[PDB]
Write a protein that binds this ligand. Structure first.
Ligand code: CLA
Ligand code: CLA
Ligand code: CLA
Ligand code: CLA
Ligand code: CLA
Ligand code: CLA
Ligand code: CLA
Ligand code: CLA
Ligand code: BCR
Ligand code: BCR
Ligand code: SF4
Ligand code: SF4
Ligand code: SF4
Lengths: 146, 74, 74, 142, 733, 158, 81
């Protein structure tokens, strides 16, 4: 295989290894809720500002509830993918070898029950992130443009 | 699509006639910026409308341009 | 091909009349034989001429190069 | 059958930068292939899945995804430089299987010892109509 | 099986995604499943028929209920010519205020669209009057659907599983159907015509309460017992009649007139009553031919045996056909599809000539929609017929059980048949295209008199014989010496002639040269589509290109690129290549009919007759102009009621185009592209964690052909349907 | 008068079409010199279409309700100068061509590789075979009489 | 067993298929039914990819080796991913 500076470099491997989807030294549920709150803070912006009620004083709650609904749909999709692909007592399929070659313990994140914890965490985190973006966009809302 | 765009843009923003006083009345009336943004518009404003002169062309000098308009399709 | 073009400009065009005033005289450089009813093809192009109107755009060139005489085309 | 396999060892690989024609998830989960040959001299040859690379002296070892590519490269090596070769299959359990010659002599020519798997001793027109065999497992060509 | 699908083990071992695809196409199929036998196949057929009937019944129940809950029937009675119908209420959370504006029409309290399916004239002709009637009918139909599903369940348990013998008992089945399903049904329909329908039209509300006392006649039930049956035709309704009440209405309940009711511009009720009372007894008698359990009657095998023209010009003749038909379903299905397609075409061709329902020949939109609907359905069924015939040849035809019989006698000279069909196609095509191009040119120069214009003299004489007078031929039924006319002048000819000679009606349209040319083009389409299908049928067993094709099953990709290349050689591929021409021919027919009627309604048939003989005339007067009301459905200045159609119109001209994407670009391209995409998604961070379950693989070749044809058909139907509705809704004339 | 179609020796819409055509032609004519060769050809076409209208008003052409000729192919030889005689003439021509081609091919079949003479015609043999057209009705006739026109069970190869 | 190969006694033992078999399926075996005393054989139909190039070569009357199609698998589909 080819190894360009993109796919192989100190800083890029460092960054990708630091984000929650690969730091196996944390419980999978916590990585799930972290990515969930990340995407929750993420999606509220355009959905609210450019929604079909933007010219209305309700556009805030509208966009936020829409974001929450999308988060719920995607959590449903996550659970469905997990129950489809992950069996309930069978082993894991996560990369158990690092770059050097340290034989890694099978990532509990890549297990049926682990994927379930991940899904629940992601859903709760998305809800929290959406409501937090709402409370920070329509109460304490001076230094922004919207 | 490039040549269609060119034809419409020219006949809607550049080409046309100039009055004695200096008022411009373009060949198509300058409806590009308000009817190029709907495919249904492309049908109505440009494709259908500006296809008249080829279809009434029978019994005139331009009648040859009419005949091909069918064989081309055929 | 170039020779055929220049010939048809020489012996079968209204090029001199077109040079007289090019504002409202349609460049025509092709006539059709009156055999099968296609006389209508030789439509009205102005300048006392009848012929299939052209759009090749040779006439602007022949006016740029100062041809201005059928002997030169010939 | 005095035609034993050779139990493909771990010998050096051809000199090649490594590129986007290598193995994928499939090779790491289901199966892959390894072709092996001895070379007469360091020359240049186009790999099946992109570009060209050089071989070394002695035995070689190339890995690939599907058997078709291995056999295509082997036919190229047999028609371009007149050298013999084998290729082996591998399973993630650790098994190794010996596939192509099955005796050492090419399947191109006759070598008694091979069985007769899949013959029908009748011309093609003698096959029967599906109605005569419907609602059964059998088919006309069986 | 260990996984979906449960009917074919061979598929379940396909880790490629095409599994799911072929896990849908080959579900209803029964031969190809694993561990399937004869009687099981028949019981499955039975359950499936019950399911289909359940579906149909739920569909019609929904129709009735929706009209009853949001329709207009009740207040539509009061003026069937100034209040548009209503289909169902709109609830669309994507509208803007002007949308809600331009949809609340016909006198409703919200956005509603206009019911065009003609269900109002149907439910009004029989005589229904109130929403409560529709509620009762909907409840009855829903209960019937539930009952049919109950049957679909019951007949798949023991103590009720019918043995294959019971299915094979063809004589008893046929006698039952021709006796009960046809005869008694017609008699019951005459009953509903003569106990509710006619008195209702005469203003007497009879229902499931009062029909015990009201007689269908002042002294009925005893004039027929008297034997002098004329007492049932004494007093019919007068020709100055109010279809809603008994003004000028008589007391006769069975007549024979032959004319059109003046007000309703349709058929009298008594005509249909008499016709059905006739057909009932016709079928009832006809259904007593075939021996079932009493030694009397006939054995169909005896009939098919006893036929052999002396001298053996047919050879062994029909010997053995009985078994090679009663042993294969696909033959029966081919016959059924053929006959059903023909009678559907017939229904289409008559329902615009003799308007059956009261006040239907006025809502022109409805007439055009119904005609086009029925014609396209007939075309599709006709294609399916030859498809399943070729399937019968591929799968169930036995050679030795049919030695020298007429069936095996067909195959021996398939070449002559295919050649002659190709000859008819070439002749019709060449000459119909020549004449068109000649007329086109001779008008392009300004000489409309030099054109070629043939007179449809044959059809004109036929019309003359039927009774048309404007041609002045003075032939049968137009002359007073012919025995027929002189024996008809007292039975039907008054009203029949009053109708056919009249012009404002739709029966027996005058015809000029354009109609001749269009009829010839239609015959071209017919013959060439027949050629495609028959070639697919006869050459299915095998030609010199692949004589052993009969061992490859019905639908296969191909037989290799060598020996000349063998793309599109399956008989499935023949049906494929025929569907195109089927759509084309039906489109031509509907074009002709729609232009003719859209000229007749505006009273300017002259324009049709003048400028319908040169193709540019069709592209100008028929498409260009008549589409101008549509393409301006929505513009930057707002929208209109026509919006949907305009939108839908474009939708067509899109889906159709997408079909091309599948008919041109074949697999290998997309296969390599999927390879690249797979590597990409595999080596991408944050996504390599998410794995796939079915290896992505581009669709198969026959699957391609199929989905491409589906796209083509969907676009080519949506486009023309939306245009046909809009062009006559924007004008209603 | 078949179905009421009067001949435009007597109808009116024909005269109206003729009048309008010659009128637009004449109005076009008055934009040049009365002697210019284009104007001369214009007047020539004017009189040509005029005499065309005249000829049509000479041969019993039953004529539509809109001012257009309309053929009568019903079989009555009264109006036969449209289909019957031109039909049999074209049938004669087509039989000519078919028979001459068939005879050429049957002749040249007897060679080493007839394809070389099917791509590159034996123009000498072609010239001495071609004018036989005057025999195509009768000759083929005798063929069918002697059964030397068709075959029974020889299908492939030859 | 995914696809299926069949060989018929019109085999003239010319050995074009094997030379053109892409994935080492066929071979020859000693027979007595032609001059070359050799007939085809398909003991390796697993790796039978399904391309007709084999029977696109057999220069016999109609054919002598047929390639009947059947269900699919991971190797009968040229999958590499
Ligand atoms: C169409 C694209 C779009 C639009 C309209 C918005 C709109 C918005 N974003 Mg935003 N955002 C987007 C895409 C978009 N986002 C994407 C793709 C990212 C990357 C994940 C972000 C990351 C982002 C952050 C980190 C923040 C916003 C914030 C905001 C809000 C205030 C922006 C400001 O004044 O500064 C506003 C509702 C700010 C906010 O308070 O949101 C409510 C804020 O802190 N956005
Ligand atoms: C089978 C034919 C059929 C079809 C195509 C439709 C079509 C429709 N129905 Mg419907 N319906 C039907 C039969 C049918 N109906 C019958 C038999 C009943 C009686 C139980 C109903 C009772 C019904 C209600 C109560 C409502 C609709 C509504 C609707 C519309 C929205 C879709 C929906 O919610 O459906 C629902 C369909 C079912 C639950 C099927 C029940 C069986 C849509 C136009 C909605 C409407 O008003 O749209 C404006 C609505 O609120 N339907
Ligand atoms: C006069 C009596 C009578 C009537 C009205 C019907 C009516 C019907 N039969 Mg039927 N049938 C009858 C007697 C009758 N059957 C008898 C006696 C037999 C046994 C010989 C059958 C065997 C039979 C079969 C095998 C099938 C029908 C089917 C049908 C339905 C055709 C779709 C309409 C219809 C409901 C079809 C159906 O949908 O199943 C109910 C079907 O496939 N019938
Ligand atoms: C085939 C369906 C059918 C059915 C179920 C009935 C049923 C009935 N008819 Mg009837 N009828 C029918 C067709 C039918 N009819 C047809 C086709 C005609 C026209 C020839 C008549 C003409 C008729 C008369 C004239 C009378 C009945 C009457 C009756 C009722 C008592 C019969 C004694 C009974 C409800 C009698 C009655 O009193 O009705 C309530 C009565 O007087 N019927
Ligand atoms: C009475 C109506 C009727 C009935 C009972 C059948 C029944 C059958 N047809 Mg059939 N057919 C019909 C009408 C009918 N057809 C018509 C009108 C046409 C012309 C369009 C066809 C064209 C047709 C073809 C071309 C083929 C069949 C096939 C089949 C068999 C398998 C169908 C299947 O599982 O695919 C179900 C398919 C799907 C669910 C996917 C299609 C979904 C469409 C595209 C959506 C629109 C089955 C016996 C197949 C067969 O016998 O193969 C052995 C076959 O190859 N039919
Ligand atoms: C458009 C179009 C046209 C015009 C045709 C025409 C034809 N198709 Mg066809 N087809 C089309 C689209 C079209 N198809 C499409 C989209 C499909 C779906 C794939 C098919 C599928 C299809 C099938 C499956 C079959 C046909 C068949 C036929 C032939 C039917 C016989 C006939 O009427 O002859 C009409 C003949 C013509 C229109 C050719 C005349 C063209 C001009 C006049 C020739 C002379 C021009 C010029 C003067 C000569 C010089 C030219 C050049 C040197 C400059 C005919 C050639 C059938 C067939 O083979 O019949 C025997 C057949 O089996 N087609
Ligand atoms: C069955 C169809 C048919 C056939 C085979 C013919 C064939 C013929 N017709 Mg005929 N014809 C037809 C329909 C037909 N036509 C129709 C529909 C009409 C109008 C009602 C006519 C009116 C007609 C007339 C008036 C005459 C013919 C004549 C002829 C013959 C010259 C020719 C054999 C002519 C004839 O008998 O020989 C001179 C003749 O004079 N036909
Ligand atoms: C003189 C040669 C000749 C003759 C006698 C025939 C005779 C026939 N052809 Mg035919 N054909 C020919 C040449 C000929 N063909 C050629 C060259 C072609 C390829 C373009 C075809 C293509 C063709 C098709 C596709 C079909 C026929 C069919 C038929 C039969 C019905 C007539 C028809 O539909 O034709 C229609 C007329 C034509 C197709 C025009 C072809 C005639 C060519 C132009 C004449 C060639 C003359 C020669 C090459 C020039 C050399 C002159 C000389 C000095 C050597 C009939 C047996 C049909 C059939 O099967 O009927 C059962 C049918 O479907 N033919
Ligand atoms: C493939 C196949 C198939 C199918 C086939 C088909 C599909 C066919 C069709 C066919 C058809 C589709 C036919 C049609 C026919 C028609 C007809 C036959 C008609 C008739 C008519 C008549 C007879 C009429 C008469 C009359 C007149 C003329 C008018 C007046 C009245 C009267 C009545 C007198 C099957 C499955 C079997 C199998 C084998 C193969
Ligand atoms: C413009 C163009 C061009 C060209 C073109 C050309 C050169 C041509 C075309 C052409 C065409 C586009 C054509 C079309 C056609 C169509 C059709 C449709 C046709 C038809 C025909 C016919 C129909 C015929 C018939 C006949 C005759 C006459 C002879 C023989 C016999 C018969 C009868 C068959 C160029 C390159 C410059 C540039 C680009 C574009
Ligand atoms: S296209 Fe389909 S059929 Fe034609 S060659 Fe390629 S594969 Fe064989
Ligand atoms: S399919 Fe035909 S070609 Fe491909 S391998 Fe099997 S035999 Fe050789
Ligand atoms: S099929 Fe053709 S190639 Fe294969 S063995 Fe028989 S002869 Fe040799």
């Amino acid at each position: 295989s080819l190894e360009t500076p993109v796919t192989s470099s100190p800083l890029v491997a460092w960054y990708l290894s630091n984000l929650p989807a690969y730091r196996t030294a944390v419980s999978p549920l916590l990585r799930g809720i972290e990515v969930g709150l990340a995407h929750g803070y993420l999606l509220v912006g355009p959905f609210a500002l450019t929604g079909p009620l933007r010219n209305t004083p309700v556009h805030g709650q509208a966009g936020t509830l829409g974001a929450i609904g999308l988060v719920s749909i995607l959590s449903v999709c996550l659970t469905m993918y997990g129950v489809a692909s992950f069996n309930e007592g069978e082993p894991s399929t996560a990369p158990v070898l690092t770059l050097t070659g340290r034989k890694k313990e099978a990532d509990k994140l890549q297990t049926a029950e682990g994927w379930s914890q991940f899904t629940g965490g992601f859903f709760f985190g998305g809800v929290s992130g959406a409501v937090w973006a709402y409370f920070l966009l329509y109460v304490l809302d001076l230094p922004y443009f919207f | 699509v490039v040549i269609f765009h060119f034809s419409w843009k020219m006949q809607s923003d550049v080409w046309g006639t100039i009055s004695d006083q200096g008022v411009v009345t373009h060949i198509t009336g300058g409806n590009f910026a308000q009817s190029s943004i709907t495919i249904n518009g492309w049908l109505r404003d440009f494709l259908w409308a500006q296809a008249s002169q080829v279809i009434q062309s029978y019994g005139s000098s331009l009648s040859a341009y009419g005949l091909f308009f069918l064989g081309a399709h055929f | 091909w170039l020779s055929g073009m220049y010939f048809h400009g020489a012996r079968f065009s209204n090029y001199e009349a077109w040079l007289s005033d090019p504002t409202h005289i349609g460049p025509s450089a092709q006539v059709v034989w009156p055999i099968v009813g296609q006389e209508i093809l030789n439509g009205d192009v102005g300048g006392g001429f009848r012929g299939i109107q052209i759009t090749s755009g040779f006439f602007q060139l022949w006016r740029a190069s100062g041809i201005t005489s059928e002997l030169q085309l010939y | 059958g005095f035609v034993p396999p050779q139990l493909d060892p771990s010998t050096p690989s051809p000199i090649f930068g490594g590129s986007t024609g290598g193995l994928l998830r499939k090779a790491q989960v289901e199966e892959f292939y390894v072709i092996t040959w001895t070379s007469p001299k360091e020359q240049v040859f186009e790999m099946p899945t992109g570009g060209a690379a050089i071989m070394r002296e002695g035995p070689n070892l190339l890995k690939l995804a599907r058997k078709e590519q291995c056999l295509a490269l082997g036919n190229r090596l047999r028609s371009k430089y007149k050298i013999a070769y084998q290729f082996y299959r591998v399973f993630p359990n650790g098994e190794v299987q010996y596939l192509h010659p099955k005796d050492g002599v090419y399947p191109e020519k006759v070598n008694a010892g091979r069985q007769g798997v899949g013959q029908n001793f009748r011309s093609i027109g003698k096959n029967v109509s599906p109605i005569e065999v419907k609602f059964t497992g059998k088919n006309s060509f069986d | 099986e260990l996984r979906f699908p449960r009917f074919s083990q061979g598929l379940a071992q396909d880790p490629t995604t095409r599994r799911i695809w072929f896990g849908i196409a080959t579900a209803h199929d029964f031969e190809s499943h694993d561990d399937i036998t004869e009687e099981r196949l028949y019981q499955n057929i039975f359950a499936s028929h019950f399911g289909q009937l359940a579906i149909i019944f739920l569909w019609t129940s929904g129709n009735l209920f929706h009209v009853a809950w949001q329709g207009n029937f009740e207040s539509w009675i009061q003026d069937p010519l100034h209040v548009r119908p209503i289909a169902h209420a709109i609830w669309d959370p994507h509208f803007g205020q002007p949308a809600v504006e331009a949809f609340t029409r016909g006198g409703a309290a919200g956005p509603v669209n206009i019911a065009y399916s003609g269900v109002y004239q149907w439910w009004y002709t029989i005589g229904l009057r109130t929403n409560e009637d529709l509620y009762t009918g909907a409840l009855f139909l829903l209960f019937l659907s539930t009952l049919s599903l109950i049957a679909s369940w019951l007949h798949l348990q023991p103590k009720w599983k019918p043995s294959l013998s019971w299915f094979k008992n063809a004589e008893s089945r046929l006698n039952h159907h021709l006796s009960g399903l046809f005869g008694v049904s017609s008699l019951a329909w005459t009953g509903h015509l003569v106990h509710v329908a006619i008195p209702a039209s005469r203003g007497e509300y009879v229902r499931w309460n009062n029909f015990l006392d009201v007689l269908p006649y002042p002294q009925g039930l005893g004039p027929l017992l008297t034997g002098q049956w004329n007492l049932y035709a004494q007093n019919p309704d007068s020709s100055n009649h109010l279809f809603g009440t008994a003004q000028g209405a008589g007391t006769a309940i069975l007549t024979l007139l032959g004319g059109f009711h003046p007000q309703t511009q349709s058929l009298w009720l008594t005509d249909m009553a008499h016709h059905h009372l006739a057909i009932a007894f016709i079928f009832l008698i006809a259904g007593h031919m075939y021996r079932t359990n009493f030694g009397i009657g006939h054995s169909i095998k005896d009939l098919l045996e006893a036929h052999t023209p002396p001298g053996g010009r047919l050879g062994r003749g029909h010997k053995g056909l009985y078994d090679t038909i009663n042993n294969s379903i696909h033959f029966q299905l081919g016959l059924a599809l053929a006959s059903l397609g023909v009678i559907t075409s017939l229904v289409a061709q008559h329902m615009y000539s003799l308007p059956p329902y009261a006040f239907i020949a006025q809502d022109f939109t409805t007439q055009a929609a119904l005609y086009t609907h029925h014609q396209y359905i007939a075309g599709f069924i006709m294609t399916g017929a030859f498809a399943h015939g070729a399937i019968f040849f591929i799968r169930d035809y036995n050679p030795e059980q049919n030695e020298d019989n007429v069936l095996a006698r067909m195959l021996d000279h398939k070449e002559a048949i295919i050649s002659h069909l190709s000859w008819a196609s070439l002749f019709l095509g060449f000459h119909t295209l020549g004449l068109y191009v000649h007329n086109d040119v001779m008008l392009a120069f300004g000489t409309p008199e030099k054109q070629i214009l043939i007179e449809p003299i044959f059809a004109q004489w036929i019309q003359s014989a039927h009774g048309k007078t404007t041609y002045g031929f003075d032939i049968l039924l137009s002359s007073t010496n012919g025995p027929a006319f002189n024996a008809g002048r007292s039975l039907w000819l008054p009203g029949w002639l009053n109708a056919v000679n009249e012009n404002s009606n739709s029966l027996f349209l005058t015809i000029g040269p354009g109609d001749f040319l269009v009829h010839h083009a239609i015959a071209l389409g017919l013959h060439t589509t027949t050629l495609i299908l028959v070639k697919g049928a006869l050459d299915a067993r095998g030609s010199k290109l692949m004589p052993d094709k009969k061992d490859f099953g019905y639908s296969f990709p191909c037989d290799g690129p060598g020996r000349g290349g063998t793309c599109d050689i399956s008989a499935w591929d023949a049906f494929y290549l025929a569907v195109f021409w089927m759509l084309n021919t039906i489109g031509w027919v509907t074009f002709y009919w729609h232009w003719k009627h859209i000229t007749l309604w505006q009273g300017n048939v002259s324009q049709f007759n003048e400028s319908s003989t040169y193709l540019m005339g069709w592209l100008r007067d028929y498409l260009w102009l008549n589409s101008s009301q549509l393409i301006n459905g929505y513009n930057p200045f707002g929208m209109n009621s026509l919006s949907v159609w305009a939108w839908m119109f474009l939708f067509g001209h899109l889906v159709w185009a997408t079909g091309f994407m599948f008919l041109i670009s074949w697999r290998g391209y997309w296969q390599e592209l999927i390879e690249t995409l797979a590597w990409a998604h595999e080596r991408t961070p944050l996504a390599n964690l998410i794995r796939w379950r079915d290896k992505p693989v581009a669709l198969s070749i026959v699957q391609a052909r199929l989905v491409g044809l589906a796209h083509f058909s969907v676009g080519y139907i949506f486009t023309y349907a939306a245009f046909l509705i809009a062009s006559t809704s924007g004008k209603f004339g | 008068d078949i179905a009421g179609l009067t001949p435009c020796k007597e109808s009116k819409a024909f005269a109206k079409r003729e009048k309008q055509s010659v009128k637009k032609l004449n109005s076009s004519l008055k934009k040049y010199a009365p002697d210019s060769a284009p104007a001369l050809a214009i007047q020539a076409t004017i009189d040509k279409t005029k005499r065309r209208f005249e000829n049509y008003g000479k041969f019993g052409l039953l004529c539509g309700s809109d001012g257009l000729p309309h053929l009568i192919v019903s079989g009555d030889q009264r109006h036969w100068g449209e289909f019957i005689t031109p039909g049999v003439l074209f049938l004669y021509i087509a039989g000519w061509i078919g028979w001459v081609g068939r005879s050429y091919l049957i002749a040249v079949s007897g060679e080493k590789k007839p394809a070389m003479r099917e791509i590159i015609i034996d123009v000498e043999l072609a010239a001495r075979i071609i004018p036989r057209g005057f025999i195509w009705p009768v000759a083929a006739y005798r063929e069918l009489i002697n059964g030397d026109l068709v075959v029974d069970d020889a299908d492939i190869g030859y | 067993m995914s696809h299926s190969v069949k060989i018929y006694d019109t085999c003239i033992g010319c050995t074009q298929c094997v030379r053109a078999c892409p994935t080492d399926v066929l071979e020859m075996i000693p027979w007595d039914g032609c001059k070359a005393k050799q007939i085809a054989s398909a003991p390796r139909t697993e790796d039978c990819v399904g391309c007709k190039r084999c029977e696109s070569a057999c220069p016999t009357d109609f054919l002598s080796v047929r390639v009947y199609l059947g269900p699919e698998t991971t190797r009968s589909m040229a999958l590499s991913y």
